[PDB]
Design a protein around this ligand. Structure first.
Ligand SMILES: O=C1COc2cc(C(=O)N(Cc3cccs3)C3CC3)ccc2N1
Ligand SMILES: O=C1COc2cc(C(=O)N(Cc3cccs3)C3CC3)ccc2N1
Ligand SMILES: O=C1COc2cc(C(=O)N(Cc3cccs3)C3CC3)ccc2N1
Ligand SMILES: O=C1COc2cc(C(=O)N(Cc3cccs3)C3CC3)ccc2N1
Ligand SMILES: O=C1COc2cc(C(=O)N(Cc3cccs3)C3CC3)ccc2N1
Ligand SMILES: O=C1COc2cc(C(=O)N(Cc3cccs3)C3CC3)ccc2N1
Ligand SMILES: O=C1COc2cc(C(=O)N(Cc3cccs3)C3CC3)ccc2N1
Ligand SMILES: O=C1COc2cc(C(=O)N(Cc3cccs3)C3CC3)ccc2N1
Lengths: 127, 130, 123, 121, 128, 126, 126, 131
């Protein structure tokens, strides 16, 4: 009766980073995909050419449908945020990070076009 | 997926001609990314053979039996021998030796540890990287 | 423009003591060439499809363009007439041969560039 | 493939905002297995040459066919006029390493350079 | 004989590197030099930093504290804080990528602590 | 109170193979080095250029001191089936003789080291 | 008649970094260890827990004897620019100090070995 | 230091292992022990066997011959069969290699001949097998 399961596509918010396309996965060492810290976390892998992973709170996850959600996610996170935080959040990503974000989105949209089992077999990053 | 006999992470015994019934786990093809196919008229599942030197194959459902534990192996042998050629029966009942006996034993140890786990955890621990 | 095969082309290869095997023409990971002349008679570097991949320099005379599994029967009967060969493969080798066929038929359903990017075995 | 400006193995200079024009090679995505796509505007997948290789989907407008190092000065002066400094340290070394790899790759037939310089991922 | 040093291979410690928070670590052998401790008059131990992006270093014994759990971190910070700029920096709570990796390390160290030293060595020794 | 511990050098006997230079190690997956199958087993790594690993019974392990033990191990195993004895005393050849030799060279180099150092140098990665 | 050869231990200077313990090695892709750019360069590998590599000019290389040279290298490098001198003499800290220290430890162990043995142990795989 | 031995790291040799044909090899350091030669009264060298499935071994100097090219293989076989006092050993030695082993032997020769066309430093950097 949990909201997300292994293979589910999510957007994750990490402070200092834009909403990033992710996939819920098992921790390569701890072999769990969700845990309690009173507050639920899920283990995610960040999509793109330089993959990363983290334990992200459910409050910082939104179900991924496509790229078109990103604008609303920014404007909603800006309205919920400190005067300096809002001006920082609405600012568009550039350079290396813009390319990697774009690469992530391309991988996530390709993953979305697949059945959960097939995308787990293709897009689960090996560690 | 909820409609097939087996799913990714399920533990099965696989029979390959010339080999004993082997402890396996149903898994995604590392290249083709499918775990089952029709060869439609006959279903196959992609399995990984447990042990210190892992292998993988597409095995017909007719050659798969749900894994419960080591105690099933004797019945599987005696049933396969009764279903089998005069030379095939004498070969099937003969107990495994050397390198293959060790690797079979190692597989059994891995399968029994995998069986003591929830499907999600065993997929995350026992899925062999290729 | 004069070679019969190019990198990414799907072929059947015959190695003495083995059945006609589903392969793909590839570059040598060290020598970086896909074809050479042994001496008068052309060879191509191929990768044998399956769960346990291998590679070799095979003579053009031992290569046939891969269309699908349906060719295997004729390849056997033709090799037998030119010569054990007619006897069907079993055990581990039958499984690996089957796995190769499955990989080759998936590779055949793809554009040459995509199949090179997906099925070129890393060494 | 015979209809696009670039193909797998072609050497190009790539411009990424905040980075100098970089010696690259057109290649297939190691995951998606495509080398070009449309986003109305064509992109090509490239690998950045060097001792620490990277890769990206770059628009055709930000790619220039690589001939040699001698082009870099003009590319900078043209990119400055269209747009408010010479590279140093770690980045200067890695850029230099890319030039060395790209110029070696340019001295080879497309098939051989694909077999030698395609970065494994 | 190893039974004479304060720490041994597999022991869980907190390590302090200037500009970084007290980090959950395990004492391990150098993957190249194959030693876990050395003298520089002053003893050092080779450690691995726990997390999703593992690192390693030769850290002085003076900068190591035996790991019991996360609850020690607050005292370690307040004691390290007690240079004017260094104190204001030390007491400040970690954010972004580093906070996530620190959290991942703690999760790994607390799992490792729930194990016998032989098992934790076999599970948590990072390959190099 | 166990006879062997992680890093200990042993000779292992597997039916159809000569007594082989090994090291007691933790299973890369199960993370245990010993188990009870009433009869104790230890997880070992076979030394050589093509390393292998297995769960071997304590009855089939002998503490490794050096190569000089091999002759006695053969003659004792032979004394312990008529065909099995003639096979056991026969000296190894080809690929297997080379790999056995490579194992002994690695084991003797491992023996010249403190247990911690040999664990850090000779534990095969899986 | 080249000053350096594969396996030789040197100090390399890269702008914005302290003199770093290296070892001359062949380029893992281009298979050359030296080239001319007029001015000779050597391919070096930077010692440490996070190894790197580069083509460094001979003018920015000094034969490595030991850590004791570092102080003189700094004071000699300390640069017509007033800001450059104050930044060069300043001691390294944090992550970089640890990795520099790890490099020195590796270079001094490499120095205690014959060239062939150190090439077989310390050549970083790529 | 290493200027007095017959072979050095990077040198191309043919190696004879009982039950196998004379094989194209390169003298290399042991990936673990980091030595390329040792005494067992009799000198051995660490070699890597060329081919698509590389192997390595410590081979006695008596079983090594400096590699010049493929053309030497016939004489090496003829010399080996003449030195082999056993009647069965001679008939086995002169027999030509087949199947998988013939292909891998061929692949080794192709690699060794490429390696021979290079300076010792370059061939060490290109053909030293990673372990
Ligand atoms: O290709 C990629 C994918 O992953 C990235 C993560 C990051 C990245 O730094 N983060 C923050 C992290 C938290 C835990 C570890 S990483 C994520 C964006 C939120 C930066 C660039 C990346 N590039
Ligand atoms: O560690 C292990 C696990 O896998 C093995 C498979 C085999 C083994 O050969 N097989 C047959 C195969 C089918 C196709 C590829 S392999 C399986 C027993 C039925 C032998 C030894 C093994 N040792
Ligand atoms: O999955 C696979 C793919 O490759 C194989 C090759 C072989 C196999 O042994 N060969 C012969 C070879 C010649 C050169 C190297 S290998 C090829 C079939 C003709 C056996 C099993 C395999 N299984
Ligand atoms: O050796 C190398 C090669 O690649 C590099 C890329 C970069 C580098 O950061 N970039 C920007 C990127 C966009 C997408 C991913 S990386 C490229 C120069 C434009 C920096 C240093 C490198 N060093
Ligand atoms: O997942 C992880 C684990 O290791 C890290 C180390 C560091 C990190 O940078 N350090 C400093 C180092 C000294 C020697 C090499 S690295 C350690 C915290 C003190 C940063 C992020 C990490 N993330
Ligand atoms: O370099 C090496 C080291 O390991 C080997 C094991 C074997 C080898 O086959 N065995 C039997 C095995 C039991 C379990 C898995 S392997 C061991 C000798 C007893 C053969 C050759 C080897 N070569
Ligand atoms: O463990 C290590 C070893 O290598 C490093 C290089 C560097 C490092 O960044 N450099 C500069 C480089 C030039 C070419 C590529 S890298 C070298 C010190 C001069 C930083 C940290 C390192 N840590
Ligand atoms: O591609 C290759 C290269 O190496 C091989 C070695 C062997 C091979 O088995 N040997 C014997 C060995 C002794 C020590 C380890 S291996 C060598 C030929 C004499 C067989 C096939 C090979 N294929």
């Amino acid at each position: 009766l949990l909201k997300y399961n292994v293979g589910d596509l999510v957007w994750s918010k990490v402070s200092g980073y834009p909403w990033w396309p992710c996939m819920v996965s098992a921790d390569p060492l701890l072999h769990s995909y969700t845990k309690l810290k009173s507050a639920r976390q899920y283990h995610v892998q960040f999509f793109g050419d330089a993959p990363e992973r983290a334990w992200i709170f459910e409050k910082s996850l939104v179900a991924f449908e496509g790229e078109g959600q990103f604008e609303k996610l920014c404007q909603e996170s800006a309205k919920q945020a400190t005067k300096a935080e809002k001006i920082k959040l609405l600012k568009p990503i550039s350079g290396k990070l813009r390319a990697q974000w774009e690469m992530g989105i391309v991988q996530a949209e390709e993953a979305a076009s697949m059945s959960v089992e097939e995308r787990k077999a293709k897009f689960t990053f090996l560690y």
